[PDB]
Amino acid sequence: QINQVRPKLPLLKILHAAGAQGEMFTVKEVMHYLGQYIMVKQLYDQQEQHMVYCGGDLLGELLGRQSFSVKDPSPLYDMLRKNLVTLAT
Numbered sequence: 001q002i003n004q005v006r007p008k009l010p011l012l013k014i015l016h017a018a019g020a021q022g023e024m025f026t027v028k029e030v031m032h033y034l035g036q037y038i039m040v041k042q043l044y045d046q047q048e049q050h051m052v053y054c055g056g057d058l059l060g061e062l063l064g065r066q067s068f069s070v071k072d073p074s075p076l077y078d079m080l081r082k083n084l085v086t087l088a089t
């Protein structure tokens with residue numbers, strides 16, 4: 001069931017838009033919803049599926065990189081540690 005977390009408002013809005021409600025979802029849920037959002041808004045390449053291509057989406061603007069890798073999520077963790085209250089997995 002639901003456990004302790006606190007996000008940032010422009011990141012919580014990605015979480016509502018990915019299918020959620022409230023602001024209370026742990027890093028496991030946040031990353032699941034980020035995967036749904038990237039697939040739902042189509043922020044990736046069909047051959048470079050390990051690579052995200054948000055190009056100017058509110059998610060890419062908020063994270064501060066408009067492209068990043070699933071095997072090198074460095075700007076994604078950097079945004080999360082500055083948005084969320086430091087949830088890690």
Ligand SMILES: COc1ccc(C2=N[C@@H](c3cc(Br)ccc3F)[C@@H](c3ccc(Cl)cc3)N2C(=O)N2CCNC(=O)C2)c(OC(C)C)c1
Nearest residue numbers: 031032034035036038039044049050051052070071073076
């Ligand atoms: C070889 O390339 C891969 C491999 C794996 C994925 C992958 N792995 C997850 C994941 C990764 C991490 Br770091 C931490 C927690 C996770 F939960 C998650 C995801 C969620 C949010 C983000 Cl920001 C990025 C990726 N993620 C998916 O959303 N998937 C994998 C299964 N099938 C799908 O269609 C969608 C993949 O994803 C890209 C398409 C986005 C591509």
